[PDB]
Amino acid sequence: DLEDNWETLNDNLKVIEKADNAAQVKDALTKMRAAALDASPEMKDFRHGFDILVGQIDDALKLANEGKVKEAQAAAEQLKTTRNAYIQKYTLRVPDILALVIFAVVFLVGVLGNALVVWVTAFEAKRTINAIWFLNLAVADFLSCLALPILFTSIVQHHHWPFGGAACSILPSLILLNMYASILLLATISADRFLLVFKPIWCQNFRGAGLAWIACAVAWGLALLLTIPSFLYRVVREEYFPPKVLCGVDYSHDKRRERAVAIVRLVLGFLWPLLTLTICYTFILLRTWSRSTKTLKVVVAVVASFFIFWLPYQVTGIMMSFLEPSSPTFLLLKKLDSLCVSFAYINCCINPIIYVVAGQGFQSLPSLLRNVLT
Amino acid sequence: FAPXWR
Ligand SMILES: CCCCn1c(-c2ccccc2)nc(-c2ccccc2)c1CN(Cc1ccc2c(c1)OCO2)Cc1ccc2c(c1)OCO2
Numbered sequence A: 001d002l003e004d005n006w007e008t009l010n011d012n013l014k015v016i017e018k019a020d021n022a023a024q025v026k027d028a029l030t031k032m033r034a035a036a037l038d039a040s041p042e043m044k045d046f047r048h049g050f051d052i053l054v055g056q057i058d059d060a061l062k063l064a065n066e067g068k069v070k071e072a073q074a075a076a077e078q079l080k081t082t083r084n085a086y087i088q089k090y091t092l093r094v095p096d097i098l099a100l101v102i103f104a105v106v107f108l109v110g111v112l113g114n115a116l117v118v119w120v121t122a123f124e125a126k127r128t129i130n131a132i133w134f135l136n137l138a139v140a141d142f143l144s145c146l147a148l149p150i151l152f153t154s155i156v157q158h159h160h161w162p163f164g165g166a167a168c169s170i171l172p173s174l175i176l177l178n179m180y181a182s183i184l185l186l187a188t189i190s191a192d193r194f195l196l197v198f199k200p201i202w203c204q205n206f207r208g209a210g211l212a213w214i215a216c217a218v219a220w221g222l223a224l225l226l227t228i229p230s231f232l233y234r235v236v237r238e239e240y241f242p243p244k245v246l247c248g249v250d251y252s253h254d255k256r257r258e259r260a261v262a263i264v265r266l267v268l269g270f271l272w273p274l275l276t277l278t279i280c281y282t283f284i285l286l287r288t289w290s291r292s293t294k295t296l297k298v299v300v301a302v303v304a305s306f307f308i309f310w311l312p313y314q315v316t317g318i319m320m321s322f323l324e325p326s327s328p329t330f331l332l333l334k335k336l337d338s339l340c341v342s343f344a345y346i347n348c349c350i351n352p353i354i355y356v357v358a359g360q361g362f363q364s365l366p367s368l369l370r371n372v373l374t
Numbered sequence B: 001f002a003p004x005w006r
Helices: A002-017 A022-038 A041-066 A069-089 A094-123 A129-145 A148-156 A165-198 A200-206 A209-232 A255-289 A293-321 A328-345 A347-360 A365-372
Strands: A234-240 A243-249
Touching: A002 A022, A002 A069, A002 A328, A022 A041, A022 A069, A041 A069, A094 A129, A094 A148, A094 A328, A094 A347, A094 A365, A129 A165, A129 A209, A129 A347, A148 A165, A165 A200, A165 A209, A165 A234, A165 A243, A165 A255, A165 A293, A165 A328, A165 A347, A209 A234, A209 A255, A255 A293, A293 A328, A293 A347, A293 A365, A328 A347, A347 A365
Parallel strands: none
Antiparallel strands: A234 A243
């Protein structure tokens, strides 16, 4: 418990920063004292630093024991500074590492895969509707995938963000854009499937490239409009101990707005689509099983993959929104945020994988994709 | 404030 004592220290430090009464301050300072005490000419110096730390903790503890909450918290701020000098004098979380691995593989597979898919569907885009659909999906996923290397770099550098406020606003939002764009596109495609099965005459009367392209345009516009509100609430914050730059969201003094965003994102981005699409393909699959399945199964697989890979993000998000920022579970989930987002990001590379698998179940790669997406 | 996405 080398890193763990320090983790308890910073966690309880944030607890003191967000303390309700003197009692919580005292308890947190007690845990900090225990963790600081729990932790050669170099060993004498690190132990010296730990001693100064424990001393300041005891001072703050005296203050808390008196009844001066604010003053004890001030002493704790100073504690943060000295702790910073002592730690800077002398590791990354497992979930962040998993997030790095996932980000990497999703980047490779997403970039190469969706570049190949775009290449393939581009030939037949204005000749076949399915090509339009798959093209739009691939473009969404790829565009989202372009943001990954910078996120990777930032995570490797312990959340440090040297790319500016604008980039901080736009690049991390691209995955959300990918979510909405994906779900709207998929919804339109699902409508198309339904009509192909139950109202074919409409399809003989309506279907042209134009309607598909318009539907795509509206899907994209709506996705952008659904993405901008969160985009505007992205802000950078400079940390002074140790010096670095953080990129994040800012719902400060507006917890209700945070909850609102979490809820709206859950409903419009997951639950409503789950309901409607499940109804849709219940219809379609029951009819089919009572009687083009090659493409249909692919579409179904993609739809399922959406919810499969978005589920943890949504769960952790909502739960986090209903938790106090000073609660241990909240801090845990906060630490798990990047991993959940990576798991969500798997959606931006899973499509070419599905296409390749179905194609293999049909037995060159672009030729195979041509045959699958047509 | 919260770094990242949430
Ligand atoms: C074929 C996709 C339709 C999207 N949608 C879903 C939809 C369903 C599943 C997955 C994604 C979206 N439920 C409702 C709908 C709702 C109430 C009354 C009538 C229709 C809608 C109708 N939406 C307007 C619209 C019209 C035409 C469009 C469009 C959007 O893009 C493509 O061409 C409004 C809407 C509404 C809720 C949404 C949403 C969009 O996205 C997230 O959640």
